[PDB]
Paper text:
A new family of protein tyrosine-kinases harboring a P-loop type nucleotide binding-domain with a Walker A motif has been described. They have been called BY-kinases (Bacterial-tyrosine-kinases) as they are only found in bacterial genomes. BY-kinase autophosphorylation on a C-terminal tyrosine cluster, called Y-cluster is crucial in regulating polysaccharide export. In firmicutes, the situation is quite similar except that BY-kinases are split into two proteins: one corresponds to the cytoplasmic catalytic domain of proteobacterial BY-kinases (about 230 residues) and the other is a transmembrane domain homologous to the Wzz-like domain (about 230 residues) of proteobacterial BY-kinases.
In order to find out the structural basis of this discrepancy, we solved the crystal structure of the chimera [name] (last 27 C-terminal amino acids of [name] fused to the N-terminus of [name]). Previous mass spectrometry analysis demonstrated indeed that each band corresponds to a different phosphorylation level, from 0 to 4 phosphorylated residues among the 4 tyrosines 221, 222, 224 and 225 of the Y-cluster. This result demonstrated that the Y-cluster of the [name] chimera from [name] autophosphorylated spontaneously during its production process in E. coli cells. Autophosphorylation was however less efficient than for CapA1B2 since addition of ATP was required to observe the fully phosphorylated form of [name]. As previously observed in the CapA1B2/ADP-Mg complex, the phosphorylated C-terminal Y-cluster of [name] is disordered and analysis of the crystal contacts using PISA confirmed that the protein is a monomer. The [name] N-terminal part of the protein adopts the same αA-βA conformation than that of the [name] fragment. Interestingly, [name] residues 1 to 8 linking βA to helix α1 are disordered. Unlike the CapA1B2(K55M) structure that contained bound ADP-Mg while no nucleotide was added to the crystallization solution, the active site of [name] did not reveal any electron density corresponding to a nucleotide that would have co-purified from E. coli. This is in agreement with a previous study showing that [name] displays a weaker affinity for nucleotides compared to CapA1B2, with respective Kd values for Mant-ATP of 190 nM and 50 nM. In the apo structure of [name], Phe220 is slightly shifted compared to the [name] Phe221 residue stacked against the bound adenine in the CapA1B2/ADP-Mg complex. The reduced activation efficiency of [name] could be explained by the absence of the [name] last residue Asn222 that interacts with the N-terminus of [name].
Residue numbers in the entry: 201 to 220, 1009 to 1035, 1037 to 1215
Amino acid sequence: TEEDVESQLGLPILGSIQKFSSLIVHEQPKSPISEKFRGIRSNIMFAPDSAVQSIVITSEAPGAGKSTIAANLAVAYAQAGYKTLIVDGDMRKPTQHYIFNLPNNEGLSSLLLNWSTYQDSIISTEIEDLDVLTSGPIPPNPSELITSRAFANLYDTLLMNYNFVIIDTPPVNTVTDAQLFSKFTGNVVYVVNSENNNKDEVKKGKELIEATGAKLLGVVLNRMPK
């Protein structure tokens, strides 16, 4: 199935994740699934002259499990020794505060608008070397925030303070938020729901990501069978 997707979509497979509290890499660190997350990490970082310090994670459509992939990949980076930040850049339908069991009264949107401080907006989790910047309150104008000087300045600060930054984003099919964040990271990981029978959507997502000019590092195939 992996080889089918690699050829039909024309992208390398960074890893395939079987169907499977969300944080399997933390709760079951020796599991074969957790090892596949470590394989994704390794495939991103060892692919010579790439210096990847940050990535956008997006998907072809809603319901692909993208946010769970992003969170577990962040745990894998932290376990490998990277001081890691996961940013919930989906300010429309945020989920990282649910995944990590955190409040969402302060986060990305409030930080950018000066309603909360840097120090208050980023939370250190109970997992060593893993911090989370939740989305904050839902703004009426998310794309304006992403393209603001405020975000450009924040991004520079994050690169000073973290060895690796992962930005979860909305799916790429209807809004351009993922593309706008890709200006900053220069790098995108594409989560594809293997259960999605609409291959036009899968192919279109690749096209949309490539149109940014960012490096499409490869695909994470999710919800694979045993």
